[PDB]
Amino acid sequence: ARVTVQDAVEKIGNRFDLVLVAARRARQMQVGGKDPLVPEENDKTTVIALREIEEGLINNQILDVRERQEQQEQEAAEL
Amino acid sequence: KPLVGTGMERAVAVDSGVTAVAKRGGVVQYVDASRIVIKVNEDEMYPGEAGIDIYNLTKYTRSNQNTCINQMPCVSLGEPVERGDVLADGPSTDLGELAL
Amino acid sequence: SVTEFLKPRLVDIEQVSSTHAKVTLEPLERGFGHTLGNALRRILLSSMPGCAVTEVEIDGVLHEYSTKEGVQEDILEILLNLKGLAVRVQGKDEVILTLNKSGIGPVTAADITHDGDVEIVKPQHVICHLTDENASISMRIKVQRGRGYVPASTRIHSEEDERPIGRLLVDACYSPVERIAYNVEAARVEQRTDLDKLVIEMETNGTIDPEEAIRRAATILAEQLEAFVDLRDVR
Amino acid sequence: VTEFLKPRLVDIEQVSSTHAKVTLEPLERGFGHTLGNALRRILLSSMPGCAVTEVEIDGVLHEYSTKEGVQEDILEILLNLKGLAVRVQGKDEVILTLNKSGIGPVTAADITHDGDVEIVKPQHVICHLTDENASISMRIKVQRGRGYVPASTRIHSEEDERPIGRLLVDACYSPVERIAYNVEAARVEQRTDLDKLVIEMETNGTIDPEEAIRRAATILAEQLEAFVDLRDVRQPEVKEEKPEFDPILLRPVDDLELTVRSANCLKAEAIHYIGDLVQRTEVELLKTPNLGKKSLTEIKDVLASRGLSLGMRLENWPPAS
Amino acid sequence: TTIKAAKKMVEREEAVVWDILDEVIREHPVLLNRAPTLHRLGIQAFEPVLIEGKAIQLHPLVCAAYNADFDGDQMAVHVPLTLEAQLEARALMMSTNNILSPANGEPIIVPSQDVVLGLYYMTRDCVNAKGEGMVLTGPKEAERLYR
Amino acid sequence: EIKELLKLGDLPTSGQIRLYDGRTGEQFERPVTVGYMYMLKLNHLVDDKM
Numbered sequence: 001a002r003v004t005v006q007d008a009v010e011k012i013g014n015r016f017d018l019v020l021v022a023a024r025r026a027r028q029m030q031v032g033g034k035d036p037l038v039p040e041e042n043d044k045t046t047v048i049a050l051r052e053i054e055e056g057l058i059n060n061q062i063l064d065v066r067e068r069q070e071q072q073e074q075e076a077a078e079l
Numbered sequence: 080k081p082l083v084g085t086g087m088e089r090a091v092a093v094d095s096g097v098t099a100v101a102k103r104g105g106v107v108q109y110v111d112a113s114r115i116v117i118k119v120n121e122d123e124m125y126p127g128e129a130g131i132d133i134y135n136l137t138k139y140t141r142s143n144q145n146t147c148i149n150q151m152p153c154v155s156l157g158e159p160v161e162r163g164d165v166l167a168d169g170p171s172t173d174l175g176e177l178a179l
Numbered sequence: 180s181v182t183e184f185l186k187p188r189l190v191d192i193e194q195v196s197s198t199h200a201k202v203t204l205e206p207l208e209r210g211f212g213h214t215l216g217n218a219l220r221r222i223l224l225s226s227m228p229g230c231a232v233t234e235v236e237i238d239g240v241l242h243e244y245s246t247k248e249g250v251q252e253d254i255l256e257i258l259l260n261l262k263g264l265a266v267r268v269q270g271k272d273e274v275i276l277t278l279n280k281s282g283i284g285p286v287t288a289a290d291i292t293h294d295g296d297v298e299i300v301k302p303q304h305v306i307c308h309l310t311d312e313n314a315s316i317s318m319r320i321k322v323q324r325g326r327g328y329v330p331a332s333t334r335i336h337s338e339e340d341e342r343p344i345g346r347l348l349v350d351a352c353y354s355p356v357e358r359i360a361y362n363v364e365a366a367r368v369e370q371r372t373d374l375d376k377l378v379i380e381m382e383t384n385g386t387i388d389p390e391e392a393i394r395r396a397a398t399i400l401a402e403q404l405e406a407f408v409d410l411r412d413v414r
Numbered sequence: 415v416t417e418f419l420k421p422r423l424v425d426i427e428q429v430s431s432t433h434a435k436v437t438l439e440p441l442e443r444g445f446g447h448t449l450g451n452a453l454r455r456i457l458l459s460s461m462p463g464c465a466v467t468e469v470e471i472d473g474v475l476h477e478y479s480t481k482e483g484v485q486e487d488i489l490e491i492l493l494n495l496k497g498l499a500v501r502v503q504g505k506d507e508v509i510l511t512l513n514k515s516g517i518g519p520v521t522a523a524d525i526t527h528d529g530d531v532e533i534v535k536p537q538h539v540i541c542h543l544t545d546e547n548a549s550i551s552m553r554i555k556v557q558r559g560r561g562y563v564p565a566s567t568r569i570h571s572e573e574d575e576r577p578i579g580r581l582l583v584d585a586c587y588s589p590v591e592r593i594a595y596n597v598e599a600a601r602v603e604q605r606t607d608l609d610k611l612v613i614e615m616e617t618n619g620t621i622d623p624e625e626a627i628r629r630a631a632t633i634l635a636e637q638l639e640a641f642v643d644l645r646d647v648r649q650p651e652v653k654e655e656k657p658e659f660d661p662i663l664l665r666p667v668d669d670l671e672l673t674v675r676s677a678n679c680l681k682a683e684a685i686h687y688i689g690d691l692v693q694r695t696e697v698e699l700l701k702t703p704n705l706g707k708k709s710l711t712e713i714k715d716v717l718a719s720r721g722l723s724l725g726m727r728l729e730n731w732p733p734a735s
Numbered sequence: 736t737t738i739k740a741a742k743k744m745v746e747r748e749e750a751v752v753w754d755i756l757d758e759v760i761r762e763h764p765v766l767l768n769r770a771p772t773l774h775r776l777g778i779q780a781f782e783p784v785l786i787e788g789k790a791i792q793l794h795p796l797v798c799a800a801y802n803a804d805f806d807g808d809q810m811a812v813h814v815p816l817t818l819e820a821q822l823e824a825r826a827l828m829m830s831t832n833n834i835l836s837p838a839n840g841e842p843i844i845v846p847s848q849d850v851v852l853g854l855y856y857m858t859r860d861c862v863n864a865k866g867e868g869m870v871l872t873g874p875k876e877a878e879r880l881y882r
Numbered sequence: 883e884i885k886e887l888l889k890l891g892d893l894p895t896s897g898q899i900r901l902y903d904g905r906t907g908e909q910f911e912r913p914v915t916v917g918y919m920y921m922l923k924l925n926h927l928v929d930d931k932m
């Protein structure tokens with residue numbers, strides 16, 4: 001149950017890229033099957049995405065470097 | 080019955096033929112939920128083929144707006160009634176009065 | 180003294196009429212008057228053991244939206260009048276009574292074939308008007324004791340019990356009480372002041388007993404209170 | 415079914431150890447309102463506790479006066495005294511001395527170590543004191559009452575007499591500071607909405623909030639004991655005493671729901687009671703004229719729905735007619 | 736497991752499936768929409784809670800923004816149906832994220848007649864009442880004295 | 883005329899009767915007016931709109 005996201009607007013430049021990176025994170029988490037890093041409350045993926053965006057441990061650049069390193073390590077394991 | 084009426088609720092109840100009106104005054108002969116048999120007064124009685132009057136109360140039937148219109152009896156046995164008096168209040172009527 | 184005070188007690192069960200009654204409780208120290216009054220009024224109006232009609236079975240008519248040659252009123256008003264009456268059962272909780280009558284006249288509740296356990300609180304309640312002579316009314320009336328009120332349509336559990344056409348359902352709005360007013364006034368004590376005596380007047384259907392209803396309400400309130408009288412971090 | 419439901423609490427928040435939030439779920443359609451109202455009206459007015467009752471200053475006889483040594487007025491000292499939470503033993507009323515001066519602000523811990531009583535918050539400041547030669551003291555007197563006591567009922571006490579002890583200050587005998595009950599919707603597995611109670615409360619720290627709730631519940635139970643069913647179920651004793659046959663036999667023959675012709679020809683044979691018809695066979699029924707296939711089958715089928723048999727052997731007849 | 740049995744269980748409406756419906760709407764907001772939409776706030780996002788009656792309960796403090804009095808106005812509800820759309824509805828068109836009118840910086844969530852009348856009656860001080868000119872030490876004391 | 887009609891019955895002439903709350907069980911200040919008004923049910927049922 002998320003009621004206020006004003007601090008998220010304070011964190012990211014605007015709401016467009018905010019909801020874009022939130023959608024990418026939710027796609028990589030829910031239909032991606034990966035693991036989160038924030039304690040949940042038996043909820044959906046949207047509100048935990050908003051929570052981990054509000055904290056600051058996940059953003060555009062962090063998602064970019066994470067997916068890049070994942071692709072690199074997958075290519076390395078592929079040999 | 081609407082408590083705060085305007086008086087017109089009587090006339091508007093008898094002008095529209097939604098309720099059963101007494102065509103000829105007489106005495107109540109037979110009361111039923113559907114059929115009302117009224118014995119005609121011998122003064123108002125017709126000269127030939129004398130007899131009685133029989134009103135068929137319109138039972139539950141679909142109106143033009145899917146609303147159930149029905150008429151209920153409002154007279155007791157042998158209750159004397161005059162010409163033009165009400166006999167069975169239809170939908171939204173009570174004792175000959177528009178009661179929406 | 181100032182702590183561990185007294186308790187109220189029933190001191191009158193005076194019935195001003197058959198249905199309208201008035202009980203008095205005393206004594207109450209202070210503030211307990213309005214508290215207990217509102218509490219008991221809410222508990223009484225909320226739910227009490229009721230024994231109204233649930234469904235009927237008329238052999239002549241098929242569905243409640245029809246007529247019956249011989250009777251004056253409509254079947255819907257018959258159902259409403261049957262809802263208006265009240266009965267009292269002691270042994271069993273559910274019972275099927277029979278209403279059978281003939282001949283011209285105002286057929287009231289007294290014409291039913293009563294049983295030993297089932298009792299009619301008021302027979303003067305008119306049910307129908309058998310206007311025609313050769314008109315014989317004969318029907319079954321199901322009455323089951325319940326708690327509170329339940330609508331007619333939402334009371335269904337399957338679709339096989341309603342297959343008999345004669346089974347006509349009515350909303351079992353069983354409620355012995357109809358209105359519960361209360362007030363407080365000065366009480367009597369050998370040497371003290373500001374003691375409050377409470378008075379509850381109740382206009383009821385006449386089925387349940389005033390003291391019995393007050394005691395049942397007090398029991399329900401005491402149970403709901405003991406539900407957390409010693410509440411802890413329980414799950 | 416004359417069987418109500420019981421709540422199952424899931425949230426008991428004890429934030430700050432003096433400001434509690436309890437939930438109760440589920441309840442009936444209206445039990446939450448009455449429960450919250452009763453609990454509020456009890457905790458606010460009818461809740462025996464203890465607080466300050468009387469103040470004693472050296473020579474300031476009037477609230478419209480001041481005394482050097484403090485940076486406030488006597489009304490501020492009275493307001494601070496109004497919150498001095500302190501609990502007492504079985505004693506009904508006890509005085510406490512605050513014969514102390516100095517420099518720093520005076521707090522609640524400055525009261526003498528009266529072992530019979532104990533203050534909740536000794537660190538609670540009583541009055542910010544002037545930092546120079548502030549030579550001023552006072553005395554307090556605490557009691558135990560029912561609930562909030564205004565100054566009006568003590569104006570009569572002021573009207574009675576006037577020794578040095580006659581001062582004026584309210585007494586919040588109720589140990590709870592604030593209470594708020596609320597109702598919300600609850601979702602039973604099939605029922606859509608029922609009353610869910612939410613009780614927020616805050617006390618002076620004399621007792622635990624849940625302890626105050628339990629005490630209010632116990633006092634309400636003590637009040638209601640005089641009418642609770644006289645017992646758990648009011649009848650843990652069952653017996654039985656019934657006659658052998660049924661009173662249907664004494665009922666007239668017209669209670670059989672038969673045709674008028676059949677009933678007439680049955681009454682014509684002096685058969686006006688079911689008990690006088692059950693103890694005989696139908697070999698004599700056909701002897702009476704106008705007793706054909708309709709009347710006989712109707713009579714023998716009505717008793718079939720009643721279980722009794724046409725033709726029996728009983729000697730107890732007729733009791734008592 | 737299969738779709739046919741699931742549809743049968745849903746249409747039968749067993750008492751067990753209610754928790755599934757409660758969980759699936761716990762964090763899945765919908766879009767309330769007024770029939771005439773003139774400004775942005777004609778469509779808003781709201782987290783639904785399950786209730787009875789075939790009527791849609793609405794917050795009183797938003798109808799003024801919706802220009803929808805309670806004289807019989809009919810409104811519609813839409814579902815995002817997409818994770819991206821759900822996140823967007825929670826982010827941009829959320830009720831809490833829309834309180835300043837798109838026309839003026841003034842709050843569109845201005846209180847309506849009932850609440851302001853209640854508060855005006857509450858704060859309208861008289862000259863003589865119970866507790867005239869007494870003294871208190873906290874708002875909780877005032878709440879106790881009032882209740 | 884309405885004043886004298888109310889005076890005929892036991893009802894107060896002011897036409898404003900005090901009320902008591904059902905939940906809190908206390909008295910409402912500012913004695914409100916209560917009466918018996920004729921009301922109509924429109925043909926805009928929710929069962930035909932949902």
Ligand SMILES: [Mg+2]
Binds near residue numbers: 808
């Ligand atoms: Mg409108």
